[PDB]
Amino acid sequence: SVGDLPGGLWGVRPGFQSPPKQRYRWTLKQSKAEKEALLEAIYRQVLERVLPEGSRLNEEESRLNNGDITVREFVRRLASSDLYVQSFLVRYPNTKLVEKLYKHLLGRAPSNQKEIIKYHDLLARKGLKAAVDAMVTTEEYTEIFGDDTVPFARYTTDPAHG
Amino acid sequence: ARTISITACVPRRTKSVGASREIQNVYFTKRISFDQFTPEYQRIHRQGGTILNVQCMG
Amino acid sequence: SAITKAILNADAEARYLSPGEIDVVRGYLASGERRVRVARVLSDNALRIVRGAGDTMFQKRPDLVAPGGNAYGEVRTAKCLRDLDYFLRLVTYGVLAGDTSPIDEIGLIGIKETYSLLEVPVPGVIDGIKAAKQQAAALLSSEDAAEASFYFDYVISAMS
Amino acid sequence: SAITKAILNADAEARYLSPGEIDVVRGYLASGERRVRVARVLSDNALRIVRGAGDTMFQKRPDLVAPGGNAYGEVRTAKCLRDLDYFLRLVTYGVLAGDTSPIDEIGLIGIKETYSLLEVPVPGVIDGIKAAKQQAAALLSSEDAAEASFYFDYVISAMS
Amino acid sequence: SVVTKAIVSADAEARYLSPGELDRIRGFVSSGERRLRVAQTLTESRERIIKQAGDQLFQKRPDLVSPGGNAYGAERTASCLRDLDYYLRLVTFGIVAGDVTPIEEIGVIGVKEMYRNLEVPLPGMVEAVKAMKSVATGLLSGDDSAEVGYYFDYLAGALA
Amino acid sequence: SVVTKAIVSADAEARYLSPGELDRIRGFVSSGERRLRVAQTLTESRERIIKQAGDQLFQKRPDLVSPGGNAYGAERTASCLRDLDYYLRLVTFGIVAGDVTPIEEIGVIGVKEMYRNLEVPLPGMVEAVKAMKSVATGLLSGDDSAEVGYYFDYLAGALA
Amino acid sequence: SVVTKAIVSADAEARYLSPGELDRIRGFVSSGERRLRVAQTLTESRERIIKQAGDQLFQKRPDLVSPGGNAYGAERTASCLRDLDYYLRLVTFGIVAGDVTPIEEIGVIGVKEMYRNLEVPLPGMVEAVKAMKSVATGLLSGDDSAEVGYYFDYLAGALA
Amino acid sequence: MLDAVTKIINRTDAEGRYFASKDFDEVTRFFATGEARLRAASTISANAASILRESAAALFTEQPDLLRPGGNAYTSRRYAACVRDMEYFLRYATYALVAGDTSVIDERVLNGLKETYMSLGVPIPSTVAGVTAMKGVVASMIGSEANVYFDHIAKGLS
Amino acid sequence: MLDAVTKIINRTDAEGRYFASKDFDEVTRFFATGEARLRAASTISANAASILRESAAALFTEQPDLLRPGGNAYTSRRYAACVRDMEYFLRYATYALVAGDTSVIDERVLNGLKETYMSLGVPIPSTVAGVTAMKGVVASMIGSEANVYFDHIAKGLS
Amino acid sequence: MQDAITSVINTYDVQGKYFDTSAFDKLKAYYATGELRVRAAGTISANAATIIKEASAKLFSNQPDLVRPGGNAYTTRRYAACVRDMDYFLRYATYAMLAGDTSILDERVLNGLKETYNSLGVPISSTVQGIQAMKEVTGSLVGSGAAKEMGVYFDYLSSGLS
Amino acid sequence: MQDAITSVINTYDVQGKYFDTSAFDKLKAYYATGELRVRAAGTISANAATIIKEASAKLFSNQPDLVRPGGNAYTTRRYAACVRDMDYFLRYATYAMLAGDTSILDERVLNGLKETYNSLGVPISSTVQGIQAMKEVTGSLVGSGAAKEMGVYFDYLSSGLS
Ligand SMILES: CCC1=C(C)/C(=C/C2=NC(=C\c3[nH]c(/C=C4\NC(=O)[C@H](C)[C@H]4CC)c(C)c3CCC(=O)O)/C(CCC(=O)O)=C2C)NC1=O
Ligand SMILES: CCC1=C(C)/C(=C/C2=NC(=C\c3[nH]c(/C=C4\NC(=O)[C@H](C)[C@H]4CC)c(C)c3CCC(=O)O)/C(CCC(=O)O)=C2C)NC1=O
Ligand SMILES: CCC1=C(C)/C(=C/C2=NC(=C\c3[nH]c(/C=C4\NC(=O)[C@H](C)[C@H]4CC)c(C)c3CCC(=O)O)/C(CCC(=O)O)=C2C)NC1=O
Ligand SMILES: CCC1=C(C)/C(=C/C2=NC(=C\c3[nH]c(/C=C4\NC(=O)[C@H](C)[C@H]4CC)c(C)c3CCC(=O)O)/C(CCC(=O)O)=C2C)NC1=O
Ligand SMILES: CCC1=C(C)/C(=C/C2=NC(=C\c3[nH]c(/C=C4\NC(=O)[C@H](C)[C@H]4CC)c(C)c3CCC(=O)O)/C(CCC(=O)O)=C2C)NC1=O
Ligand SMILES: CCC1=C(C)/C(=C/C2=NC(=C\c3[nH]c(/C=C4\NC(=O)[C@H](C)[C@H]4CC)c(C)c3CCC(=O)O)/C(CCC(=O)O)=C2C)NC1=O
Ligand SMILES: CCC1=C(C)/C(=C/C2=NC(=C\c3[nH]c(/C=C4\NC(=O)[C@H](C)[C@H]4CC)c(C)c3CCC(=O)O)/C(CCC(=O)O)=C2C)NC1=O
Ligand SMILES: CCC1=C(C)/C(=C/C2=NC(=C\c3[nH]c(/C=C4\NC(=O)[C@H](C)[C@H]4CC)c(C)c3CCC(=O)O)/C(CCC(=O)O)=C2C)NC1=O
């Protein structure tokens, strides 16, 4: 009844990632520790863990801290960055990249063959960057995560939003 | 390439009010690359928003 | 150019030029005289290259200039030859730049939508560019012809 | 501060302060007198704490002030002792606020890359900070020493 | 729980608990005997609290137990008093836990949808929770009355 | 390597390698013989490069092998020389690959955490790598000396 | 179909169908017999429609069946007429469905890649669809011709 | 955001000095008033729904033309948004009362609000009147403890 | 971004003409200076940490007030950001040196930098002095090959 | 996750009962141990880096082939991954000692870890030995009673991976 | 992925060895063929669409039921997907030939491919026939040595599928 993780028999979440109910939102005036924690959560959620030091983006982090770009823009740039390529693309086929991108950018799994076909076609014809651009400009992303929240794994049924 | 500064107000007139802060998602200024400018333009329009100002730095 | 692409890779990782990128920039600077030579040959003979390419294309595809064809009439055929001259100038830009970036930035991005709206048969453009490649390879040495043929083939493949 | 953390947690959920959060704020407001006592003792004794900690740090690691050492010379020894004084002031701030937010905001975020680019030996800094912790514990009671040592150990662990 | 919220806050930032979170846990565990005596006191007088609070609620809201009311009949009134007992037990749980987390996860999340499906008026629930608050704080001393009242106040706000 | 970097960049963009990338690979495979001779030359000069670099490091940083230093003793000095040994082997790998990918993947990513966990001072890394640079590039001709210096400079910048 | 679009729109909003959506469905089901009779009329006249549409297409674009054309030869002309028959059957499917969804799913998605692989000129496809529309609407009444022309115009716009 | 202790710490840090007697005096004075401010904040939280209800009633009794057709508060959704904004002001005034410092109001509430209302068409003076009425209700319930934070919100909008 | 060759290509393309002998002359001159510019860039890259450390030392020795409490370079965080911006300037000057053009500096560094520094409170003449000190160090190490790009950064800040 | 208090609450809530004398005894026991747990957690957080240094030194001295070529911890990247894994093990054991409950080790650490280690080629017995080394060092630093407390969660991790 | 050079590098790194005569000979063998591989990659890239037109025409002529109603390639969408998959096979064969290694065929293509095709019902024998036709068309462009080299990677794909 109390303190159970969503998923029942599968209510587990690897400690490398964020706790399943945590939400990380960017505000314009927040402490520098809050900013660093938000960046760390973005990496933890897109790349599934913290990278060895020296691997984080330099200029993109400065833009995000300043508010020049948004969390959604940072996520877009990270998911198409060389880090994401070396982490997932070089070791998986594009079909696996479709589930990886769903998990990282939308917090869920593809539900049917049309959802796989869309981003697999984008990966096949235009590459990773086009698939990421398409996924983070969906209305589902805009309504669930908006522009300033880190994407998260979603565990409550919400048929209108996927 | 090039980057465009957009200043816009995107209202919430189509959905129920919430107790969270959304003043950022409503009125904003951001720098977007040229390739994202048409999607941003159209999504601002589709949500009932008004594009207050457009600038090209340089 | 190649220098621009190496700098972009260095910038994306917030680092200085790597030994591989330095080798790239050095090998590009070493190709300077050869690329400039090929560019002068293609630029100085541009008019005759375009004349021959248009002749060959119109021979292979008469329906282009046949009544009801896309290039029918003086103005539309001249517009066609202008497009061929455009693509040749872009090929020279690619030869000097050492990459295909100027060719994309000026003529290849949006060319398919353009030619589909105008009902320009892209295969015929491909014959015209193939003819220009043959004309230019006539005027170049084997290595020089190989150097220019890379960008001619890139234009052809981007069309098709 | 502790109140800042409770309020930020309540605002993150768009709700009012919960009984646990109200209890946290009440506990901090109760501990305020002891906090002010510990901070006052550390503040009036800053000179002797920093002097003793610097003496024992330089005795443990004489190569730091030896020629070619990172703190060799009057100016660099002065900057080293100034850094130790800075960290003592940050420990007092943390003792007052009830969390490490002042310590993190003012002195810790960015110290690692700062000392990396300056090639300042972090183990030397940690030796000075531990030395300051023992100097402070000498002037404090056992419970006051434990309260101060919490924030001293936070600083050490952030350095390490 | 206080301990669970501290651990989850530390886990969300992938860090050890700070001095502040440890202070919060110390404050919680140092109060365990008092809140546990309060839980025992509420638990032993559950019949007294439920009966008096039901009497106060039905005097304050006669429409609930008159015909056409949701609690009209002895069986529906017994159901009413039964989930008053539910909320009193949840209050005792939250008192030993130091936070409203058990109350929120057992009896608050989804409560409005449940009471709409059951046709239970939410203002009637708010009045019932206020009656339980008055009776339960009547049985406690002032300092304990305030801390229990916070839990009941959270409950009433959650039902509204 | 160079070929892998080109293929991965093309793969992530769902395209065949462009003329510029094919130029990069062509220049790389044309230089394979001289790269491979240079890597051989560095391989025969194994014991001398490691020994002289270690001597220069220990002279310019005598604290490392003084008591309490990280490289103090015969075993720790042997482990010290073994790390330089590793890094020279990585520099030969990167020379044959045409890029610093082997160096980055085997001995740069995570190197900060490794040496922090081992208490090995990074400025000692930098000085030992620069000493290896001087000794190694002392053994090659003009162009090859600069080419190998770039790899050593990448590695010394990464260790900083 | 019409019902599918209504249900999908309602499901994307996670609600029951509004009065307007049910109005769309009532309008669709009322006109069912008219659509079915139109579809039967077109299905009875399959071969004569395809024969006449092919005749007008090859009359107005003789270059398609002229030597060097995409449809030159009996086999390629038969494939052309076969594609016209496919799209006629798709139009009948769309007519009974009340919307162009069957046409879109069976013969529109990926059509341009398909015909580019087949060297089939898209303007010729547009002209064939216009010819087939002329023949098919000429067989229908004034009212029915309008809605079937709408499906043919959708198909011609999609192939354009 | 800042509380009173953090404000004093920042003031001392900007001078790079340790806490002196006067700074310890503001700190101890903040600690002395802490329990009364907590009691007031708990009182506000327990009665938030009522406070909001008669604040809205007072505002729309004073200015019924906001609720009339064509008024800024005329639709169910716009009345919702009005009361939602008043709930914002109440909650953040409570946060400022617990912290003892008005910064949380500045960064969380007032930052970009005046421009956002002008873009939305929300009337500033009527919103200020609503804040004032809410201040009156809160003061009737707890006293003058939270007056300064409501005045801060009113000045920020005005 | 633009290098010198792409800038010449854009000039010709805007004119619509094939390369003439003059344009081929600028292209050959760029190719001629390329190898020396590469050597200078490699020298800068090999000594980047030393150059950055020396230039930060020079700036803060010449303006010690920036590091005192209340200075814009006073905290570990603000100092790290200052030396981070110096590293930005050095790396982008090196990019511009290799490309033979200042376009990368304009689009990647200077665009909106003044507005960012005024919004943050970063003092512009202090940063310009830092760029000047960095220019002096880099000139001491590689000669006058890169001081035009540092001058461009200083003018863009000014 | 659950702590001792939440475990008691869960038992009594699913049974539908109020707290009895035995429940109050269990809650008193957790409150009594709370001071020891907080002390031990502070000591561990103060000393986490040193504990990792000593534990990895002992593991790589007992099994020198791990960090030599051919060993799973030979490269800077794989050594870093190793010590990061040990750090996460230490932090989650400290969490579970504070909670007085091993549930967080089930939710955040163990589930799927054996499979990941087998799939990556990580030696699992060597990882268990590293966890034991951390146990020895931590017991040294925390004292006898806190050592007996932390040993429970260390052994839980060891048996879960074994 | 691994190319030939990084394959040798990895072997010697795992052994903890410098390059010796055998390693230098393997690297010379790869460098010697590099001009041929680059020429073949350029030729294939120049003629890719033609290769796919010819290979798909041959495959659908040999198996007409694939494109008639009821076939797996009967619709415009499934025809487009089929020649898209042929584009995969051509592009990844060219990558592997240019690398001199079949690794990228393992990470990026073959892994999960049989499962994808079996779940979709894509006929695997027909796909192998299309791959064989593509091999023949490519050999009829690139020349004897490059054709023999591209054949290795085409048979690698065919064997992985069948
Ligand atoms: C916590 C910080 C915060 C504040 C303060 C805030 C104010 C705020 N009020 C809004 C809407 C609104 N606000 C009001 C306010 C009312 N207009 C009436 O005339 C009254 C005079 C007045 C209140 C007493 C109204 C009517 C709207 C709806 C505007 C519209 O969409 O037409 C909006 C647009 C987004 C939405 O509708 O949810 C914002 C951002 N938002 C924030 O995140
Ligand atoms: C430098 C970058 C650049 C390119 C590449 C370019 C292509 C281009 N060609 C165009 C027209 C045209 N292009 C052609 C050429 C076609 N005629 C035959 O069919 C051939 C198959 C084929 C050429 C070999 C023709 C005939 C037109 C006129 C079409 C019309 O009158 O509607 C147009 C439409 C604007 C106009 O009226 O000229 C563009 C944009 N324009 C540019 O600014
Ligand atoms: C209030 C927050 C704050 C902190 C913490 C801080 C640390 C700090 N110390 C610095 C220099 C320094 N710091 C030290 C201290 C070292 N000397 C020995 O080696 C020891 C291991 C160690 C001290 C225990 C030394 C010697 C320098 C001068 C180094 C140089 O200029 O090359 C610098 C570079 C700027 C300057 O020269 O002032 C910073 C930013 N600065 C701040 O604004
Ligand atoms: C542990 C969390 C929890 C709660 C709180 C809960 C309440 C709850 N109350 C119920 C019935 C009821 N509950 C009430 C109570 C209402 N009557 C008056 O109006 C009052 C205003 C108000 C109570 C103070 C009544 C009258 C019923 C019977 C109505 C019916 O049968 O539909 C039911 C339907 C099944 C049953 O009778 O057991 C539930 C589930 N269930 C839970 O699992
Ligand atoms: C139901 C959806 C669907 C369609 C539409 C479809 C079309 C289709 N057309 C094809 C060839 C063809 N299609 C055409 C038709 C075009 N050529 C002329 O220019 C005309 C303008 C035009 C027809 C009006 C021709 C001539 C060919 C033979 C091309 C060749 O093989 O060389 C083929 C290759 C297999 C074969 O020839 O049997 C297909 C699959 N397939 C489908 O699954
Ligand atoms: C490559 C493109 C790029 C540039 C140029 C850039 C500059 C830049 N510097 C910043 C902060 C800063 N920059 C400085 C530097 C100044 N302080 C003074 O004392 C010095 C004289 C002077 C440096 C020489 C400081 C102190 C800050 C922190 C300001 C603060 O924390 O309030 C910020 C705000 C975001 C952040 O905190 O990281 C930006 C965007 N960012 C970029 O992505
Ligand atoms: C290829 C990637 C890689 C590297 C580089 C690597 C180095 C490495 N060096 C180690 C120890 C060491 N490394 C050093 C070297 C340092 N001492 C001085 O300060 C010098 C500045 C400096 C050498 C120039 C020393 C002295 C030790 C012994 C430390 C001890 O006894 O614990 C260890 C611990 C276990 C062992 O002895 O092997 C590793 C793993 N391992 C790797 O998988
Ligand atoms: C908080 C719960 C949690 C754990 C524990 C966890 C473990 C974990 N360890 C990993 C890799 C690794 N783990 C190790 C550690 C082992 N190798 C040595 O030989 C030792 C004997 C031993 C450790 C003492 C190594 C070397 C790798 C790298 C494997 C590789 O790169 O192929 C990975 C693969 C992803 C990556 O490299 O970042 C995971 C998920 N993940 C979690 O979410």
Ligand SMILES: CCC1=C(C)/C(=C/C2=NC(=C\c3[nH]c(/C=C4\NC(=O)[C@H](C)[C@H]4CC)c(C)c3CCC(=O)O)/C(CCC(=O)O)=C2C)NC1=O
């Ligand atoms: C590079 C590694 C890779 C491959 C190969 C790959 C293939 C692949 N082919 C797919 C569909 C398909 N693939 C084919 C191709 C087949 N049709 C048959 O007639 C032919 C014998 C055969 C091709 C020659 C077809 C028809 C579909 C559509 C299946 C359907 O919609 O039911 C799909 C489902 C998603 C989509 O429709 O885009 C995948 C993932 N994905 C990958 O990441």
